[model samples]
Target: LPTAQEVQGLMARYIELVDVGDIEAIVQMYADDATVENPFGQPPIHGREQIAAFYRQGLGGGKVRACLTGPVRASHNGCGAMPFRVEMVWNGQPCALDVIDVMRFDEHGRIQTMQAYWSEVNLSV
Candidate 1:
């Protein structure tokens, strides 16, 4: 179980990787068999390879500059979730999207699984 600060650091690093479009660093954070599901209607992306592709094609190439996340809600057992609002400039327009990430950590403090939930409303608006 990682300390709260450690988890927060991990979250920060995750955001940094996204902001910099560092797909390699982003993939390194996930476990081998990890899965990512973005929003309820989207298909579930399984494995590191698939997630990496999604990040590269969908997120990495998408219009995004700067992201802010905080006021997280974490569980004491090191397996907690946080709801976040991401503010970014997309398609020359500023947008704010609400999301929730459920994270589970391995014994060694590595992130085992991260399930993300978001909506397309933010993108359409």
Candidate 2:
């Protein structure tokens, strides 16, 4: 079982990897069979290779920063998830939006899978 602090730290690392465009580090965090589905018209991306590609094309250029407020809503089943309002300063302007990230951990405390949900409509207005 993972503690709340450990879970929060994992979430923080995720944002850091994205903000710095650390593709290798990002891929390392995911399990071999991990999948990602961007909350848009984009199709579901499965596996580390595809995920890396998706990030490269979509989030690679932007400077991303996520600020998680309030206590994490943890699961009793060894899964930790939370709702975070990310302030992404892409290019210049700050795009504030809410995102819910659900993470499942393996027996060794490594992240097994992470699913993120967000909406452009929410960020825009």
Candidate 3:
């Protein structure tokens, strides 16, 4: 089991990696059979290959920026959550999405699963 501080560190690093658009490094942080649901309710992307493609499309665009909006929250059970805002241009208009991401870490400190919570109502132009 990962300590709360470890979980928080990973979550913080995730935001930093995303901000830098390091898709490969980000993918390496996950377990081999990890799963991700960026919108929480949507179908999850599974495995490193699929996860790589997802980030390649989203973060690789070079027009997106992510920053934590609040302190990351960690639990005793190897899980952590963070609130952040994603800024980007959609249809040539600047917008921001307030998001909360929850991640579960494996015994090795790799991410086992990730689910992001956000919806259209959280978007601002």
Candidate 4:
């Protein structure tokens, strides 16, 4: 299990990677068999390769703006969580969508699973 400080450090790097559009490096932070749910209800993405594909297409091929709401909070067990928001344009209007993500780390400290909580209702225009 990672110490609370270590988890905080991990999330800091993660927030940086996302904000900088470093999708490849972000994928590398995951374990070989990590699972990702950017938002629940969609088809779950599994493994590093699939994660890479998803982010590459989504972040790599876009004009992006994003932020972590604050530091990652430690939870019971080996999970860490944080809220984040992405800013963008929708139907010719500016919009911001908020998401809360929970991540579980593996013994090696790699991300084992990441689940994001969000919905269209959270979008602000």
User: Highest lDDT: which candidate?
Assistant: 3
Q: Relative to the unseen true structure, what is the C-alpha lDDT of residue 114 in candidate 4, on a scale of 0 to 100?
A: 90
lDDT agreement of model 2 with the native: 0.70
- Residue 71, model 1: lDDT of 51
Runs in model 3 with CA error above 4 Å? none
* Candidate order by decreasing lDDT: 3, 4, 1, 2
Greater lDDT among 1 and 4 belongs to: 4
lDDT of 4 by residue, 5-58 (tens): 778778778878887889988998999999999787777899999999988876
Q: Of the candidates numbered 2 and 4, which has the greater lDDT value?
A: 4
Candidate 3, residues 1-125, lDDT tens digits: the string is 68999898899999999998999999999999999998999999899999999999998878789999999999999999999999988779999999999999999999999999999999999
Model 4: how far is 62 from its true place, Å? 3.9
The worst-scoring run of ten residues by lDDT in candidate 3 lies at 57-66
TM-score of each: 0.77, 0.73, 0.97, 0.89
Q: CA lDDT, every prediction?
A: 0.71, 0.70, 0.94, 0.84
Per-model tally of clashing residue pairs: 0, 0, 0, 0
Error of 3 at 81 (Å): 0.8
Error of 1 at 60 (Å): 3.2
Tens digit of per-residue lDDT, candidate 1, span 1-125: 77776677677667777767788888888877777777645677788898889878756765554354655556667666665666666677777777777787666776777777776765533
Model 1 scores what on Cα lDDT?
Answer: 0.71
- What local lDDT does model 3 show for residue 121? 98
| lDDT (tens digit, per residue) of candidate 2 on 1-125 | 56667766776677677657787898887777776766634576778888788777766666655656555666655578777776666456776788777888766666676677876666842
- The candidate 2 region of ten consecutive residues with least summed lDDT is 62-71
